[PDB]
Design an enzyme around this catalytic site. Sequence first.
Site, short mmCIF file in Angstrom:
data_model
loop_
_atom_site.label_atom_id
_atom_site.label_comp_id
_atom_site.label_asym_id
_atom_site.label_seq_id
_atom_site.Cartn_x
_atom_site.Cartn_y
_atom_site.Cartn_z
N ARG A 177 0.85 -1.18 0.00
CA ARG A 177 0.00 0.00 0.00
C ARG A 177 0.89 1.24 0.00
O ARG A 177 0.92 2.00 0.96
CB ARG A 177 -0.92 -0.01 1.23
CG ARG A 177 -2.00 -1.09 1.17
CD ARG A 177 -2.82 -1.16 2.47
NE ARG A 177 -1.97 -1.43 3.63
CZ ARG A 177 -1.44 -2.62 3.92
NH1 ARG A 177 -1.65 -3.66 3.14
NH2 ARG A 177 -0.67 -2.75 5.00
N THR A 243 -0.60 -9.96 5.64
CA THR A 243 -1.75 -10.64 5.05
C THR A 243 -2.82 -10.92 6.11
O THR A 243 -3.85 -10.25 6.14
CB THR A 243 -1.34 -11.96 4.36
OG1 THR A 243 -0.57 -12.76 5.26
CG2 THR A 243 -0.52 -11.67 3.11
N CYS A 348 -1.33 -20.06 -2.64
CA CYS A 348 -0.72 -19.74 -1.35
C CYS A 348 -0.29 -20.93 -0.50
O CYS A 348 -1.10 -21.80 -0.18
CB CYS A 348 -1.66 -18.88 -0.51
SG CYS A 348 -0.94 -18.38 1.09
N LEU A 349 0.98 -20.95 -0.12
CA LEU A 349 1.54 -22.02 0.70
C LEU A 349 1.28 -21.75 2.18
O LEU A 349 1.34 -22.67 3.00
CB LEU A 349 3.06 -22.13 0.48
CG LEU A 349 3.53 -22.80 -0.81
CD1 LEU A 349 5.03 -22.65 -0.93
CD2 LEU A 349 3.15 -24.27 -0.79
N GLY A 350 1.01 -20.50 2.53
CA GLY A 350 0.76 -20.18 3.93
C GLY A 350 -0.71 -20.18 4.33
O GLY A 350 -1.06 -19.71 5.42
C1 HEM Z 1 -5.13 -14.51 4.65
C2 HEM Z 1 -3.82 -14.31 4.24
C3 HEM Z 1 -3.26 -14.64 3.00
C4 HEM Z 1 -3.77 -14.42 1.75
C5 HEM Z 1 -5.16 -13.91 1.39
C6 HEM Z 1 -2.72 -14.82 0.81
C7 HEM Z 1 -2.85 -14.74 -0.57
C8 HEM Z 1 -1.90 -15.20 -1.45
C9 HEM Z 1 -2.07 -15.14 -2.88
C10 HEM Z 1 -3.27 -14.55 -3.59
C11 HEM Z 1 -0.97 -15.73 -3.43
C12 HEM Z 1 -0.67 -15.90 -4.91
C13 HEM Z 1 0.04 -14.69 -5.51
C14 HEM Z 1 0.21 -14.79 -7.02
O1 HEM Z 1 -0.28 -15.78 -7.61
O2 HEM Z 1 0.83 -13.88 -7.60
C15 HEM Z 1 -0.12 -16.14 -2.32
C16 HEM Z 1 1.15 -16.71 -2.46
C17 HEM Z 1 2.00 -17.04 -1.40
N1 HEM Z 1 1.69 -16.89 -0.05
FE1 HEM Z 1 -0.03 -16.31 0.73
N2 HEM Z 1 -1.60 -15.35 1.47
C18 HEM Z 1 -1.91 -15.20 2.82
C19 HEM Z 1 -1.04 -15.53 3.86
C20 HEM Z 1 0.27 -16.00 3.71
C21 HEM Z 1 1.16 -16.28 4.82
C22 HEM Z 1 0.81 -16.20 6.31
C23 HEM Z 1 2.35 -16.66 4.30
C24 HEM Z 1 3.47 -17.05 5.05
C25 HEM Z 1 4.51 -16.16 5.34
C26 HEM Z 1 2.17 -16.63 2.84
C27 HEM Z 1 3.09 -17.17 1.96
C28 HEM Z 1 2.84 -17.33 0.61
C29 HEM Z 1 3.82 -17.85 -0.32
C30 HEM Z 1 5.09 -18.60 0.03
C31 HEM Z 1 3.32 -17.63 -1.56
C32 HEM Z 1 4.02 -17.93 -2.89
C33 HEM Z 1 3.74 -19.34 -3.39
C34 HEM Z 1 4.27 -19.59 -4.80
O3 HEM Z 1 4.55 -18.60 -5.52
O4 HEM Z 1 4.40 -20.77 -5.18
N3 HEM Z 1 0.88 -16.25 2.49
N4 HEM Z 1 -0.70 -15.83 -1.10
C1 LIG Z 2 0.28 -10.99 -3.33
C2 LIG Z 2 0.95 -11.55 -2.00
C3 LIG Z 2 -0.28 -11.45 -1.01
C4 LIG Z 2 1.71 -12.93 -2.10
C5 LIG Z 2 2.29 -13.17 -0.63
C6 LIG Z 2 2.75 -11.69 -0.25
C7 LIG Z 2 2.29 -10.86 -1.56
C8 LIG Z 2 2.27 -9.34 -1.28
C9 LIG Z 2 3.30 -11.24 -2.75
O1 LIG Z 2 4.16 -10.50 -3.20
C10 LIG Z 2 2.88 -12.68 -3.15
#
Ligand code: HEM
Ligand SMILES: CC1(C)[C@@H]2CC[C@@]1(C)C(=O)C2
EC number: 1.14.15.1
Length: 405
Positions: A177, A243, A348-350
Amino acid sequence: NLAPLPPHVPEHLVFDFDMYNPSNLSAGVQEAWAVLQESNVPDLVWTRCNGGHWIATRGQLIREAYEDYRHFSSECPFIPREAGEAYDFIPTSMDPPEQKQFRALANQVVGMPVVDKLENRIQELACSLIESLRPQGQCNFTEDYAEPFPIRIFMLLAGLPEEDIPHLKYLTDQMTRPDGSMTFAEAKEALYDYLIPIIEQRRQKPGTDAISIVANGQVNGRPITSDEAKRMCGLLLVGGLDTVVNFLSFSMEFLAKSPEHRQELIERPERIPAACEELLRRFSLVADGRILTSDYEFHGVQLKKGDQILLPQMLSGLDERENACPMHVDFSRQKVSHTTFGHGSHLCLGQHLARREIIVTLKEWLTRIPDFSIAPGAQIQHKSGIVSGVQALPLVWDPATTKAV
Ligand code: HEM
Ligand SMILES: CC1(C)[C@@H]2CC[C@@]1(C)C(=O)C2
């Protein structure tokens, strides 16, 4: 500030939407973005704001584009282009098959098994935070719970000092943001300036923390480089700090305004998981994109190589063709369809960790503070961006109605 329309864009496909400052923001961020789904707006439009880019407004198109990495690459995922170009986090900035190997390692540090092991800690912290707040009869949810709860759990997982939270949180927010105080490139440099020394140390004297695991991991049979570890930890930092933090506030703001929904969850606890899914759909908050690798005709529209396209993950579940009465929160929906955690190879892995933190919060909060509301006279303000959020959330309640557990 509208950028001049490119030659290949038909004027009837123009709709000047600014993802960093949408028009109906006062009505709520999700509502502001939902204007893109009005009958007068085509399924695929071009906005002249933020440099000019396409925006897919329907769940079907968003899913399709996220599945087809051949035409829509993750190389430049952020808008404006300058941000997308400076963006180099792993594995999000990589396309398959390269992404796969790094994704496997990242799954090792935030995957399901790690969540299972941190369960008791998540529960203890949630209970501890709520119990300390309970007798006060008021708090600013965003800073008193939404931020500390998920962030401290992450700092624990990463093995980083709590004192660094204020600094790290500021940098992360600048990336999702943009304040205007600094460019994405600069925010990224600072974040990396912080990680480099740490990774260097964890490479020599490894610990059991997530960073130590990433820094000494193996990819494609060989050891990960310092640069690769740095770029992966950078992504883990942003995900852990920006997030769940914002999602909790959207959810709590809604629960504070809907006694009937709070009651429902208090009387029928078996509904919490389903409720969690519905809240994730209704208060979806992420929106990033892809870049065209070549000229491509998408659903009748001609896209040119290098064109950037925003594929709002938040819009899929608000699409009426996917969910009836999308703005209505219904915990007993027969089918909750959304792409809140993404779609395609970058799912998303998290999400397992996030779902655990959300469910624990709902259960432990409603157990001790079943009745609460937004402070009188307070005006809740939402902020739009790659990840949307809430400025502040002043809450009040009668301590006499709380339950010490
Ligand atoms: C409610 C919270 C969360 C939402 C809505 C969210 C949403 C997303 C989305 C939409 C993506 C895909 C981005 C893309 O395709 O360009 C993503 C990727 C990812 N998120 Fe989450 N996320 C959340 C929480 C987290 C948390 C807690 C972590 C851990 C630190 C995290 C780690 C990741 C990682 C590692 C990826 C990349 C996976 C890949 O590229 O293979 N996220 N997330
Ligand atoms: C779009 C996201 C929510 C996802 C995890 C953190 C984020 C800001 C990225 O750059 C990939």
